Design a protein around this ligand. Structure first.
Ligand SMILES: *[C@@H]1O[C@H](CO)[C@@H](O[C@@H]2O[C@H](CO)[C@@H](O[C@@H]3O[C@H](CO[C@H]4O[C@H](CO)[C@@H](O)[C@H](O)[C@@H]4O[C@@H]4O[C@H](CO)[C@@H](O)[C@H](O)[C@H]4NC(C)=O)[C@@H](O)[C@H](O[C@H]4O[C@H](CO)[C@@H](O)[C@H](O)[C@@H]4O[C@@H]4O[C@H](CO)[C@@H](O)[C@H](O)[C@H]4NC(C)=O)[C@@H]3O)[C@H](O)[C@H]2NC(C)=O)[C@H](O)[C@H]1NC(C)=O
Ligand SMILES: *[C@@H]1O[C@H](CO)[C@@H](O[C@@H]2O[C@H](CO)[C@@H](O[C@@H]3O[C@H](CO[C@H]4O[C@H](CO)[C@@H](O)[C@H](O)[C@@H]4O)[C@@H](O)[C@H](O)[C@@H]3O)[C@H](O)[C@H]2NC(C)=O)[C@H](O)[C@H]1NC(C)=O
Ligand SMILES: *[C@@H]1O[C@H](CO)[C@@H](O[C@@H]2O[C@H](CO)[C@@H](O[C@@H]3O[C@H](CO[C@H]4O[C@H](CO)[C@@H](O)[C@H](O)[C@@H]4O)[C@@H](O)[C@H](O)[C@@H]3O)[C@H](O)[C@H]2NC(C)=O)[C@H](O)[C@H]1NC(C)=O
Ligand SMILES: *[C@@H]1O[C@H](CO)[C@@H](O[C@@H]2O[C@H](CO)[C@@H](O[C@@H]3O[C@H](CO)[C@@H](O)[C@H](O)[C@@H]3O)[C@H](O)[C@H]2NC(C)=O)[C@H](O)[C@H]1NC(C)=O
Ligand SMILES: *[C@@H]1O[C@H](CO)[C@@H](O[C@@H]2O[C@H](CO)[C@@H](O[C@@H]3O[C@H](CO)[C@@H](O)[C@H](O)[C@@H]3O)[C@H](O)[C@H]2NC(C)=O)[C@H](O)[C@H]1NC(C)=O
Ligand SMILES: *[C@@H]1O[C@H](CO)[C@@H](O[C@@H]2O[C@H](CO)[C@@H](O)[C@H](O)[C@H]2NC(C)=O)[C@H](O)[C@H]1NC(C)=O
Ligand SMILES: [Ca+2]
Ligand SMILES: [Zn+2]
Lengths: 400, 237, 144, 48
């Protein structure tokens, strides 16, 4: 009965099928549209526009082109350059902006009207910094891919001052994916405890070059700071001796969740990830899992505010959308058990800060959960580990 | 952690650690989470008159604070000083600030213990009356960043930034000599104090409270105490 | 407004958030965008209708790297200001790998000028070879 | 099967007693660190 149009800005694939974030938005609309139990009168329709994703001017047109047509929330691009633009369109005219991928929030950017459902790297970098203390490292080498990664792991770079881990930050070579000269230096440099900061595509291609240099053995241990380590085909590396510890927020143990990934893989029908990639075939990437949660967390907010109607906001003679003050509260005061656990925001800046990492690692049966991280608690590990005898009733030397 | 019993004259609400919503006189038994509190008026730059007793004829550990033309905050909590605090102590003053500034000038201090050599037969004492804190007062073991002198004042802040006392400052003012307490010759050690302070308004919500402790004979600044730990506690427990 | 009125060169909305808007405007409609303060050039941001007259920190972070080799330090300490500031020192953080430095990176707390928490800890760790990355306003505030 | 068990590293050395080691595609193992010494009787250096 009642109309409610969401916006959408996604990457422009010119020949193949659309992106994983765009299909996840089209999926999560259609899932809520066919279920009346959640949202009885909504007729959620999409306005998915496509940009070149590297143009902050083109992102400002398709933000206004949706908003002149009328939206309720803009689900944003996935760049750092385009998201800083469209946020300031959304902050100016009123409608909320729903981010699903990490952005460098400038500390002096006084904005409401944005929430970031990606787990913020300030809280992730504690979970890496907690994890390196569990394994008691002192010779940590951070390897990132682009210069933005120093912002993301900045709480990891800022800790040889408190603790005793000696950081030796390196960088993957740009304009290539052939990191043979990097891994020569790290093997010669006796660097046995490595923390990559890669996307899961480049975290897969780094391992085949680490395998062919004989560098994944029993005396190496890699921490991946991706939330998508589960999608790596680890079949060449399972018997190797290598330790691959990572984090996963995608709550695959829940059968209501695991039904969706099963429903996801069937409905894609996309281009095949050939074995030169190194990835498994049908999964939900954590970039596309959060866009599934992006619809629901707003869909909780439209439930609590049924009076909401859509206006025709024009960007030049701009005024605040009169529901935009009220509707931003119900997005931030919202809780929803999505695919990535619970989604709870922060009453300050809309960064997702309280979340649920499952710490997975590599044993000889595949990737396997060895604990659970939480921001309030610490590493709840020793869930796969059992034992620690410590029999000190020995050595018989001298009483006195 | 050193065993320590203090009277927080807390000028800042610390709701995370059990301090009430109002600034308050308190009392401590190895805990910044206070046993008993009471509302304190916390006037601006004015003067002083505080007073702390523990008479084991009534075994009430009392503390009162009064400005001139103001009321008195009786915050007396019955606690057994038998086992909660060692045989030999080293009393003194403690004050701190953090992220908000305040002046914590002490300008006179006394003490008077009386503990039972044999109840009638001429009990011991340690009466002193420091009204004239000098520039080189060599019977104070003033720790941290405590300053003194330049007037008749004991400045327990890094001060003289036009009286805006350089926030996240801390300074203790331990007296030089030990006192016999535990029980052993039982515990009527009616220790008195007089604790005329001055807390100047910095136009900045004056905050983090002055203390008066009875510590271990060995003490220092515990692990950084510029703030909620109020100058003398390691932890918030 | 200015492109509709007609200009020749837009001289630098001089902040990282405000530059990336007007830069891609100037790449679109053609006019040169004369940047006058360092911003973050995104590696896949395929633009060229702009110049940036601030000296690049790909060159400057080698120059601070030149002095710590010339003064032969081994216990350097970076104190920076914003989260952008680690991009300003790319080559400096990336070089205990190539040499014998022991970069211990520290950050000034935001919304304040108290290095009284910081310099208390820097005296504690016996750090005497500090490399600041402030502005010139926040330089003298820490020196005091 | 020796590669997938992480067993061809800098501190291993394999002697093959085949006279046909040259026909092994050694492209996955060239950068590995592994020492593979063998014999070859096929006189490939002669242009005839
Ligand atoms: C969500 O994202 C959050 C990011 O914003 C992040 O939360 C942040 O967490 C840190 C701790 O890790 C926290 O710092 C604490 O919070 C106190 C209040 O914040 C103040 O001050 C901070 C700087 O510390 C500023 O960033 C804030 O904007 C706010 O500043 C305002 O500006 C004026 C400027 O003059 C201040 O004077 C005002 O305080 C404030 N004005 C307002 C709110 O209108 C901070 O003060 C805390 O310090 C406490 O300990 C000190 C030790 O000496 C005391 O001196 C000090 O006074 C503090 O005691 C408390 O003070 C509070 C107000 O300051 C009062 O509530 C109480 O009186 C008192 N006692 C209590 C509470 O028991 C401390 O540093 C950040 O502030 C916080 N950011 C926020 C809240 O926005 C989270 O990690 C993210 N996740 C989640 C799950 O939340
Ligand atoms: C990454 O690091 C991990 C440790 O930090 C590695 O786990 C080790 O590897 C073995 C084999 O994969 C694990 O063995 C499993 O453990 C349980 C119970 O313990 C058994 O362990 C003893 C030897 O310690 C064995 O003799 C007994 O049979 C016990 O039964 C078994 O139920 C499993 O079936 C399996 O045996 C260990 O947990 C652990 N061992 C040691 C010595 O650390 C992990 O394999 C590393 N990844 C690699 C090498 O690729
Ligand atoms: C199998 O075991 C062999 C040892 O028994 C390994 O031999 C090593 O082979 C490498 C080539 O991959 C040699 O490097 C050569 O060095 C000479 C001269 O040395 C100088 O050259 C480098 C430049 O490469 C220079 O930077 C240094 O200053 C050296 O002093 C060059 O003329 C060659 O072109 C080639 O570079 C090693 O010297 C050699 N010996 C070792 C490491 O002791 C062999 O590689 C093993 N197979 C593996 C590991 O797969
Ligand atoms: C439309 O969506 C609603 C909202 O999820 C569906 O109703 C409820 O769905 C959940 C998820 O499957 C069911 O929860 C179950 O809870 C029990 C105990 O808490 C536990 O076994 C599981 O944790 C499970 O998640 C819940 O039973 C269900 N409520 C019903 C059926 O009344 C609804 O099923 C959706 N509509 C359709 C047609 O599927
Ligand atoms: C790390 O995660 C484990 C797994 O949940 C936590 O252990 C759990 O602790 C709760 C404490 O309330 C246990 O609940 C209670 O335990 C009794 C024991 O028989 C049980 O009958 C009930 O279920 C009751 O609710 C829970 O059983 C226990 N789970 C286990 C041991 O598998 C642990 O507390 C976590 N550690 C942290 C957060 O530091
Ligand atoms: C849409 O319109 C009517 C408006 O009254 C709906 O009636 C209620 O709608 C709310 C929100 O959708 C529900 O929570 C109530 O349970 C509905 N009550 C009843 C009695 O239906 C109605 O659901 C819709 N009607 C049509 C024809 O689509
Ligand atoms: Ca307090
Ligand atoms: Zn208190």
């Amino acid at each position: 009965t009642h109309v409610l149009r969401f916006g959408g800005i996604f990457e422009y694939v010119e020949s193949g099928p659309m992106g994983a974030e765009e299909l996840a938005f089209r999926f999560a609309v259609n899932t809520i549209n066919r279920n009346r139990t959640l949202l009885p009168n909504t007729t959620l329709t999409y306005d998915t526009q496509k940009i070149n994703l590297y143009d902050s001017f083109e992102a400002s047109k398709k933000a206004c082109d949706q908003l002149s047509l009328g939206v309720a929330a803009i689900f944003g691009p996935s760049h750092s350059s385009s998201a800083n633009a469209v946020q300031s369109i959304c902050n100016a005219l009123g409608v909320p902006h729903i981010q699903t991928r990490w952005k460098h929030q400038v500390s002096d950017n006084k904005d409401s009207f944005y929430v970031s459902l990606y787990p913020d790297f300030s809280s992730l970098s504690r979970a890496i910094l907690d994890l390196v203390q569990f394994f008691k490292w002192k010779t940590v080498t951070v390897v990132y891919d682009d210069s933005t990664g120093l912002i993301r792991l900045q709480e990891l770079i800022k800790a040889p001052s408190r603790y005793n881990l000696r950081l030796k930050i390196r960088q993957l070579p740009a304009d290539t994916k052939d990191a043979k000269p990097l891994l020569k230096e790290m093997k010669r440099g006796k660097e046995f405890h490595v923390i990559f900061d890669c996307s899961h595509e480049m975290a897969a291609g780094i391992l085949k070059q680490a395998l062919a240099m004989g560098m994944m053995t029993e005396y190496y241990h890699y921490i991946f700071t991706t939330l998508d380590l589960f999608a790596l085909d680890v079949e060449p590396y399972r018997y190797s001796g290598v330790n691959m510890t990572g984090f996963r927020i995608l709550n695959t143990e829940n059968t209501q969740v695991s039904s969706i990934i099963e429903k996801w893989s069937m409905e894609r029908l996309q281009a095949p990830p050939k074995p030169d990639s190194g990835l498994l075939d049908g999964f939900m990437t954590t970039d596309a899992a959060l866009m599934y949660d992006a619809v629901h967390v707003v869909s909780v907010a439209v439930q609590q505010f049924p009076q909401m109607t859509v206006s025709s906001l024009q960007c030049n003679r701009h005024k605040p959308w009169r529901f935009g003050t009220r509707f931003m509260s119900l997005i931030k005061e919202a809780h929803w058990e999505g695919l990535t656990g619970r989604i709870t925001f922060n009453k300050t800046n809309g960064l997702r800060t309280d979340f649920d990492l499952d710490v997975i690692s590599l044993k000889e049966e595949g990737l396997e959960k060895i604990g659970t991280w939480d921001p309030a608690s610490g590493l709840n590990m020793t869930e796969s580990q059992k034992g620690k005898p410590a029999n000190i009733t020995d050595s018989l030397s001298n009483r006195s | 952690a050193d065993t320590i019993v203090a009277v927080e004259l807390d000028t800042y609400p610390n709701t995370d650690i059990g301090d009430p919503s109002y600034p308050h006189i308190g009392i401590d038994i190895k805990s910044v989470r206070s046993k008993k509190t009471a509302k304190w008026n916390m006037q601006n730059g004015k003067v002083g008159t505080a007073h702390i007793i523990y008479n084991s004829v009534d075994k009430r550990l009392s503390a009162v604070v009064s400005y001139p033309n103001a009321d008195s905050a009786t915050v007396s909590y019955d606690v057994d000083l038998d086992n909660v605090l060692p045989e030999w102590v080293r009393v003194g003053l403690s004050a701190s600030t953090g992220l908000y500034k305040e002046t914590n000038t002490i300008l006179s201090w006394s003490f008077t213990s009386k503990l039972k050599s044999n109840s009638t037969h001429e009990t011991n004492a340690l009466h002193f009356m420091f009204n004239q804190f000098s520039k080189d007062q060599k019977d104070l073991i003033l720790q941290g960043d405590a300053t003194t002198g330049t007037d008749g004042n004991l400045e327990l802040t890094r001060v003289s930034s036009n009286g805006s006392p350089q926030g996240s400052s801390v300074g203790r003012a331990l007296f030089y000599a030990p006192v016999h307490i535990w029980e052993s010759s039982a515990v009527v050690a009616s220790f008195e104090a007089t604790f005329t302070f001055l807390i100047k308004s910095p136009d900045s919500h004056p905050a983090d409270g002055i203390a008066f402790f009875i510590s271990n004979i060995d003490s220092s600044i515990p692990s950084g105490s510029t703030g909620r730990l109020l100058g003398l506690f390691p932890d918030a427990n």
